[PDB]
Design a protein around this ligand. Structure first.
Ligand SMILES: NC(=O)c1ccnc(-c2cc([C@H]3C[C@@H]4CC[C@H]3N4)cnc2F)c1
Ligand SMILES: NC(=O)c1ccnc(-c2cc([C@H]3C[C@@H]4CC[C@H]3N4)cnc2F)c1
Ligand SMILES: NC(=O)c1ccnc(-c2cc([C@H]3C[C@@H]4CC[C@H]3N4)cnc2F)c1
Ligand SMILES: NC(=O)c1ccnc(-c2cc([C@H]3C[C@@H]4CC[C@H]3N4)cnc2F)c1
Ligand SMILES: NC(=O)c1ccnc(-c2cc([C@H]3C[C@@H]4CC[C@H]3N4)cnc2F)c1
Ligand SMILES: *[C@@H]1O[C@H](CO)[C@@H](O)[C@H](O)[C@H]1NC(C)=O
Ligand SMILES: *[C@@H]1O[C@H](CO)[C@@H](O)[C@H](O)[C@H]1NC(C)=O
Ligand SMILES: *[C@@H]1O[C@H](CO)[C@@H](O)[C@H](O)[C@H]1NC(C)=O
Ligand SMILES: *[C@@H]1O[C@H](CO)[C@@H](O)[C@H](O)[C@H]1NC(C)=O
Ligand SMILES: *[C@@H]1O[C@H](CO)[C@@H](O)[C@H](O)[C@H]1NC(C)=O
Lengths: 205, 209, 205, 205, 205
């Protein structure tokens, strides 16, 4: 306890909070999705509801420490309110995202952070034809809302969405699910924005 | 990090928060809408649900800095809780507005602020006739709830709503969408209030016009 | 900015918050309603939903200032969390009231406060017969929940509810709408309570 | 204002908050219900929704003062967040209770507190037969969640629920409504727990 | 009051908060479920809703005290916000868990904590066949979201779920209900995670 209390006090009480990335100190966030369930489709409003969790990884110099000076602590758990987290947002949501897990991240001595929130998302998707053999395809982009590619870049480790925890008795079966980096331009702003495009093809079981 | 931490500490820890605009220091907020989806209509209650984002821009002297004194930082991102934001309100809403994006603004060295919240709004609109070729027209006013035209004025850069991100498989297609400055008077108060009137003409998606 | 910052600092940082009215320093709150819409009726539960705004006015000595000493500032806007507000409550609500506007009041140099929240209220009302020519009448009382007439009195400026912003394409038309001061006695307490009774007569358009 | 500000500062800024009752300093809470409406029944889930208010009374030595020393103030209103309140809980609820009134209590110079929150509760009840002449009977227990009878005892002043504000045009009429002290034993714990059992018999009007 | 105020001040005002368990100071949490009601099933989305309470027990050295030094106080009640609590999470939920009881724990002089929150959970379950004699079986895992088996281990005192408070007029009757410790591995992480698997077999009454 003593060494960890001392480490946390040294990282968080002694400086002002990290103010987020900049053009001079940019950041790369690694994203990956694990799809648990397509819970429902609403064919009268063209909304689909997914339950998933989203692995987020990044690295800050200001969260580094030497394990020898703190009892060989190599990592610790801390509330996501104590640290900066990237503002990753679904670009075609129709309701606020619901949080289904504790908001706690793991920080490692090299300054790397892992944060894996479980979420339920309603987003824009036409499910017409879901009851056929071909199924339907829907897509949603995840990216920073306010940081361009000059401050936050994104990447994936794989283009395959993890389906190994997909609920076996869902109403819908997944035919494929990919996650792919893209670059976009928007009217407000001259700078390129990065997102990961989650594309899911599914049909009634 | 160091220069930005120092800049933020100088802007926010050294004074009391900006107390908002006044008759002597009025403010102009620029509004623009980007309509993403008409999600549903309820014909039994005359409520329609929109998903959009609303570009807000304004400028304060108290957020100015000289970039040379702070490592050539020209702008930064900060939580919308750290700064004053205008109290722009839909005047015919029937539910609290739902927030669909992080509440983070960008402040620039000249004191200008950009803030672009994504929202879902339920508002008063009669959708009778939406299933015809002509469609229906609905309107909603956005303005300050508590500041008159003497403290907050509004403008748009264009009268055309941005429809280039409108969801192509929505149940409803947009025939037109405008955003226009107006002046109103209300019973409580002799002072004029300014709003931007969002007028949308739409109909059910069909196979031909 | 400077003069207003100084005024606000003098009113709010230098004293403990106003502790509310008492038997020795009673308060009169003026109420007025502006009815925007009867949104729906539920005939299976006898609940009706109104959207309105409620003008509240009161006056405290502790919010007085001399304009000459503060750059001729005659009034200012401040968050409703910074000041005391009266605990005006609907007496036959069936759900928490939903807030549809910013919670910001205007304070004037004589100590007077204006606060005009927009609300959606579900309350107890039998809509049977709403589809006839005579329509139906419903009523809801608004008053302080915890202050009797000895600490908070209420009044209206007019007995006519403002209908000049009533939604012209509502499903329901208003035949009449009044707002009237009343005195009530309740089981808990010997002291009289004051309310304003909002009576609305309406029918299907 | 001055005397009340001074009294409140003396009661709340000068000590740590009251830490709640104990085996050595037990507390008796008096409960009484005023039933306003049975709003709806759901026969597919066996849930019923009540709107009521719950009178709570208790007495602490640490809230005593001498009126002579504070301008003859005999009582005052304060936010329920400023004082300890008993953790009275419905034992068969199916949703979080909704709060329908301001959370403000009245403290009297002898240390006695009155607190009367309005609530909407969904609880477990089979409404099958509600459309007959005999109606149905349902029951819900209210008591402390975490304090046994050794720290919190309950009582009522009467076994009759107050029905004098019951909504006259409710879908349901009340045939009877009682509130009765009981003792219960639970699996977790050898100590007796006290509750007040609210028993309501009703049918369709 | 005095001795308890002093004890609480000594435990909570004098140190930084306990930072949670680590590889060097691991923790065992004991879990047990008391099932109150299966409230509803949704056969169009494969979601089932349970109301239960979850007994949690653990022990920290930093919450120890000597009763002789504090008036023979052997335990006390405190808000769950004042102490660390384990991040026990349902692994197949489809909505945020609703809290149905006060969040108050009991701390004992040996450093042991008991915490028994009431909850409503929607989780993934196919109710097809619930209207037959055989019924249906559903399962949900509860465990730490962010701590592996190296920091948090779990156990049960019994494998039988407590059914002695199960609502007798529920739409569904319970045929069996077990709670069993398991070890799992997940894609993100090489370390084993521990859960308690709640398996319920039920049918229409
Ligand atoms: N200099 C600036 O003020 C600036 C520069 C780059 N991005 C933004 C920005 C951008 C966005 C938009 C970009 C994407 C699409 C809509 C919204 N998310 C939102 N909020 C923002 F503040 C603002
Ligand atoms: N000096 C004053 O007391 C004063 C002067 C101008 N406007 C307001 C005001 C006005 C409003 C209304 C104006 C529009 C229509 C309803 C609401 N928004 C709300 N809150 C307000 F405080 C108050
Ligand atoms: N001396 C006292 O303790 C006292 C004197 C006057 N009114 C209240 C009171 C009254 C109320 C009720 C009175 C009306 C009807 C229900 C609720 N509003 C609620 N909370 C209250 F505290 C308490
Ligand atoms: N010494 C102890 O640890 C102890 C002694 C007595 N009651 C509880 C307790 C009891 C309860 C249960 C008692 C009733 C039934 C379920 C829940 N409310 C909840 N929270 C609790 F902490 C704990
Ligand atoms: N060294 C690390 O960064 C580390 C080590 C072990 N577990 C996690 C972790 C793990 C999880 C997942 C593990 C299980 C399955 C999904 C979620 N709960 C969530 N958040 C986490 F932080 C992180
Ligand atoms: C690192 O590990 C060893 C125990 O294996 C021990 O010397 C010491 O606890 C650690 N280093 C410190 C405290 O500096
Ligand atoms: C700021 O710009 C000037 C040149 O205009 C130069 O001194 C330097 O490269 C910049 N400073 C930093 C800290 O980037
Ligand atoms: C305030 O009012 C007086 C007029 O009575 C004037 O002389 C003074 O300059 C004014 N100050 C302002 C507007 O700042
Ligand atoms: C309190 O009552 C007594 C009269 O019996 C009086 O001496 C005292 O001044 C009173 N205080 C007031 C009214 O503030
Ligand atoms: C503490 O010890 C016992 C209870 O086990 C009690 O009889 C005694 O009065 C207490 N003494 C003090 C000093 O509190």
């Amino acid at each position: 306890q003593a060494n960890l209390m001392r480490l946390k006090s040294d990282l968080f009480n002694r400086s002002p909070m990290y103010p987020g990335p900049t053009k001079d100190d940019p950041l790369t966030v690694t994203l990956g999705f694990t799809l648990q369930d397509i819970v429902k489709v609403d064919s009268s409003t063209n909304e689909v509801d997914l339950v998933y969790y989203e692995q987020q990884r990044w690295k800050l110099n200001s969260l580094m420490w030497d394990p020898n000076e703190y009892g060989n602590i190599t990592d610790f758990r801390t509330s996501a309110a104590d640290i900066w987290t990237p503002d990753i947002t679904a670009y075609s949501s129709t309701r606020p995202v619901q949080v289904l897990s504790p908001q706690i991240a793991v920080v490692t001595h090299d300054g790397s952070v892992m944060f894996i929130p479980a979420q339920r998302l309603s987003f824009m998707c036409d499910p017409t034809g879901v009851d056929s053999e071909e199924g339907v395809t829907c897509a949603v982009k995840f990216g920073s809302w306010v940081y361009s590619g000059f401050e936050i870049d994104l990447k994936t480790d794989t283009d395959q969405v993890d389906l190994s925890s997909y609920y076996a008795s869902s109403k819908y079966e997944i035919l494929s699910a990919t996650q792919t980096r893209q670059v976009q331009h928007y009217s407000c702003c001259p700078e390129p924005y990065i997102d990961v495009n989650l594309v899911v093809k599914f049909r009634e079981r």
